[PDB]
């Protein structure tokens, strides 16, 4: 007697289990149990993943309603689930998304000094270097502090929020909400400092005022600063970081990159394709009785979208393992998710990666693994799969 | 069919494996499967255990021979796996221990004032806190820089090589030859320092220039630096950590030790005993056929000491998995090993909790986990297991 399959499968991000494509193959949609005992409904073919992104009645928002199976503990408040939903209603969507555009004047040379600054202080110390903690991770923190229009000097504080805001707990975490309103509390401040005027927080602020928001509440605007900036912060932090894991142990690639620097964008595409950065299924419940694939999925249930199904899935991307830069449709992969909420950092996070990828080559055409890749340490119960360190040399 | 068991079982240092219980009854000496792919000896009752460590035909020195078995790769070069017998062949045995006893005049009271500082300094930030990071960790580092004799600005530098050096992995390491040589280069440095001249540091450099120790290499003196710093900390760091989390999981006892802190001593005994810092058992290399329990040994065969499995022994230590502060023997357990190679800085690394706990107990009377204990993020393939970080309120 066995025990139903457990998800998620294993914390690695270098690797993906050989049991992702025999489920794909023999039951594309199919019931397993979370952290928190709940059953769901597993998903892992493109097509299966595709339809139940691109229909709404599968809801991200009622996913926060008491009682309902869970994929893990809530670390925000339940209506902050709804946080596009709700910067929408507010009539606030366009002024975010013209906030967070990689386009804005002086932005990306600001990327630019930013990553080679940050990769001469290595060069500088000597190897062996932490690409995560010295690298991704501050250039991910610095780009939001810049988004933002936040002083560059409270990003190491409000970054110290992130290893456990992102954790995927079976459990309610109370060191969550002590970090979560202390800020909310920074945010609110920032909303009514006068220093404050650019960036997505200048804009905010400056709509605060405006007579056509006066009935949208303080709450949501602080809510927009926080969940931005941790959003943005762990995604990039965490693609870049496992990004240049899969380059690291790419040296042909590497080395045409560094040759043609020009082909580096499509080299980001499929980085993101294959990337293993999101720890678990994309979480929806079923606001209706809806047939996916074999199966006849009740109102109530949850399902569980998992990204590197649809991402490795050969019907869709031939021989899904290998980083191929000539592909038809190199940027139909799931890794910014699909329909309704379709990340809306995707430009930015693309052009992070690309800067980020760029400086690094330039610098350190030789960098290498430090350690054998299995000593990479994984983090455990956490919504993002990272090595806890990447060391280095080049 | 399945494979030969594999070890280790699990990185969690907050459990014991059930299987450790169902070995040592049905099978206390056995053979299983290390990470490099040799076969060795598990021996995991309390009888079993002691027998092989104070046979010394068991040897510690031969486990670094070309061609045998391994537990995991040498970080270290192969003549520092002796390197206490070196340090005995020198003559430098007595002036070593001389020089690690937490009686020296001022040390203790060092050890206080900085428990103290760390914990007020977390204390005014406010809550969530990182007990290993923030707490144990520099603690260690402070304790072992007054002990060496080198500044204590030194520290951080000198530990962040500890995530590498003791690394238990499958293959070598090049960025440990890194640090090793660079650390080597550190200590070669000091013993030619004029204002170095108190501790372990400042005595070796008197040593040196003594003529009954003229021969004696600069090799080992500065070797007996890295190695008594690195041991050390990473011991008396992961010792406190793990003891931390055994206590804040026992309100009872913790009580008890707040309200007596004379019990303290006997308390850390029994932390001692439980403790899982240890990720590996001890390896000893057979150097003739030797018959433990069931099993006759062959020259050249590794055997690896569970220490919890004779710490958790129930026929030594009636309701082994119980802290219990009035049993018979409570010092006759393998924390710090047995016979030859048991630890010479055991007496440093019991004060060093004992204050430790002292401190925290006396600031933090309210300290507990923030979050729940299952998300601590148990490091792999290390010598030690140790959360990545402690989160903690109070
Ligand atoms: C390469 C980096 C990034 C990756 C791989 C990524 C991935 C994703 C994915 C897969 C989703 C969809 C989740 C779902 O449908 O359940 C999503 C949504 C979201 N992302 Fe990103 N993201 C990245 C960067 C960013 C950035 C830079 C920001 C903001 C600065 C951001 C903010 C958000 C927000 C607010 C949502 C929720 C959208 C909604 O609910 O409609 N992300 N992200
Ligand atoms: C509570 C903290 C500590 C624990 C739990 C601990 C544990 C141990 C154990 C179990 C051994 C025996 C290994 C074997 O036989 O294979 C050992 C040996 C050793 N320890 Fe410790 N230790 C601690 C603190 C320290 C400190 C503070 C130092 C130095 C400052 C130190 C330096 C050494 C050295 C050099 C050896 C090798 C002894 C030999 O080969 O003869 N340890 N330790
Ligand atoms: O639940 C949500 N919360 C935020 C993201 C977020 C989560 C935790 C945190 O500490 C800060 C920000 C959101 O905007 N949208 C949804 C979905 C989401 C979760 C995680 C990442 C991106 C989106
Ligand atoms: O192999 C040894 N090396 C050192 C300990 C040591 C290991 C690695 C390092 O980077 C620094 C110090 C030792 O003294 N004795 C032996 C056994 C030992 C290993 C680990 C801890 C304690 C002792």
Same mark, same amino acid.
């Given at each position: 007697?066995?025990?139903?399959?457990?998800?998620?499968?294993?914390a690695?991000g270098?690797?993906?289990?050989?049991?992702?494509?025999?489920?794909?193959?023999?039951?594309? $949609?199919?019931?397993?149990?979370? $952290?928190?005992?709940?059953?769901?409904?597993?998903?892992?073919?493109?097509?299966?993943?595709?339809?139940?992104?691109?229909?709404?009645?599968?809801?991200?928002?009622?996913?926060?309603?008491?009682? #309902?199976?869970?994929?893990?503990?809530?670390?925000?408040?339940?209506?902050?689930?709804?946080?596009?939903?709700?910067?929408?209603?507010?009539?606030?969507?366009?002024?975010?998304?013209?906030?967070?555009?990689?386009?804005?004047?002086?932005?990306?040379?600001?990327?630019?000094?930013?990553?080679?600054?940050?990769?001469?202080?290595?060069?500088?110390?000597?190897?062996?270097?932490?690409?995560?903690?010295?690298?991704?991770?501050?250039? #991910?923190? #610095?780009?939001?502090?810049?988004?933002?229009?936040?002083?560059?000097?409270?990003?190491?504080?409000?970054?110290?929020?992130?290893?456990?805001?992102?954790?995927?707990?079976?459990?309610?975490?109370?060191?969550?909400?002590?970090?979560?309103?202390?800020?909310?509390?920074?945010?609110?401040?920032?909303?009514?400092?006068?220093? $404050?005027?650019?960036?997505?927080?200048? *804009?905010?602020?400056?709509?605060?005022?405006?007579?056509?928001?006066?009935?949208?509440?303080?709450?949501?605007?602080?809510?927009?600063?926080?969940?931005?900036?941790?959003? @943005?912060?762990?995604?990039?932090?965490?693609?870049?970081?496992?990004?240049?894991?899969?380059?690291?142990?790419?040296?042909?690639?590497?080395?045409?990159?560094?040759?043609?620097?020009?082909? $580096?964008?499509? @080299?980001?595409?499929?980085?993101?394709?294959?990337?293993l950065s999101?720890a678990?299924?994309?979480?929806?419940?079923?606001?209706?009785?809806?047939?996916?694939?074999?199966?006849?999925?009740?109102?109530?249930?949850?399902?569980?979208?998992?990204?590197? @199904?649809?991402?490795?899935?050969?019907?869709?991307?031939?021989?899904?393992?290998?980083?191929?830069?000539?592909?038809?449709?190199?940027?139909?992969?799931?890794?910014?998710?699909?329909?309704?909420?379709?990340?809306?950092?995707? #430009?930015? @996070?693309?052009?992070?990666?690309?800067?980020?990828?760029?400086?690094?080559?330039?610098?350190?055409?030789?960098?290498?693994?430090?350690?054998?890749?299995?000593?990479?340490?994984?983090?455990?119960?956490?919504?993002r799969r990272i090595? *806890?360190?990447?060391?280095?040399?080049?």
């Amino acid at each position: 007697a066995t025990v139903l399959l457990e998800v998620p499968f294993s914390a690695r991000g270098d690797r993906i289990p050989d049991a992702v494509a025999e489920l794909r193959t023999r039951e594309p $949609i199919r019931k397993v149990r979370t $952290i928190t005992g709940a059953e769901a409904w597993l998903v892992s073919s493109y097509a299966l993943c595709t339809q139940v992104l691109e229909d709404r009645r599968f809801s991200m928002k009622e996913t926060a309603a008491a009682g #309902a199976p869970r994929l893990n503990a809530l670390t925000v408040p339940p209506e902050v689930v709804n946080n596009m939903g709700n910067i929408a209603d507010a009539g606030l969507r366009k002024a975010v998304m013209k906030a967070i555009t990689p386009k804005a004047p002086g932005l990306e040379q600001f990327l630019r000094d930013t990553a080679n600054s940050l990769l001469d202080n290595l060069i500088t110390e000597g190897a062996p270097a932490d690409l995560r903690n010295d690298f991704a991770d501050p250039l #991910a923190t #610095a780009l939001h502090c810049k988004v933002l229009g936040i002083p560059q000097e409270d990003g190491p504080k409000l970054f110290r929020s992130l290893s456990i805001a992102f954790m995927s707990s079976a459990d309610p975490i109370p060191a969550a909400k002590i970090n979560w309103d202390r800020d909310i509390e920074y945010m609110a401040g920032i909303l009514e400092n006068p220093n $404050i005027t650019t960036g997505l927080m200048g *804009e905010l602020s400056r709509l605060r005022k405006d007579p056509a928001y006066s009935h949208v509440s303080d709450e949501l605007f602080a809510t927009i600063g926080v969940t931005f900036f941790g959003a @943005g912060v762990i995604s990039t932090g965490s693609f870049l970081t496992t990004a240049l894991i899969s380059l690291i142990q790419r040296p042909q690639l590497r080395n045409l990159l560094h040759e043609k620097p020009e082909l $580096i964008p499509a @080299g980001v595409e499929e980085l993101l394709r294959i990337n293993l950065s999101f720890a678990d299924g994309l979480p929806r419940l079923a606001t209706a009785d809806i047939q996916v694939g074999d199966v006849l999925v009740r109102k109530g249930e949850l399902v569980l979208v998992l990204l590197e @199904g649809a991402n490795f899935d050969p019907e869709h991307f031939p021989n899904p393992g290998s980083i191929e830069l000539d592909r038809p449709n190199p940027t139909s992969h799931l890794a910014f998710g699909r329909g309704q909420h379709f990340c809306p950092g995707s #430009a930015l @996070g693309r052009r992070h990666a690309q800067i980020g990828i760029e400086a690094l080559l330039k610098k350190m055409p030789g960098v290498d693994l430090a350690v054998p890749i299995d000593q990479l340490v994984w983090r455990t119960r956490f919504q993002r799969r990272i090595p *806890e360190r990447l060391p280095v040399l080049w």
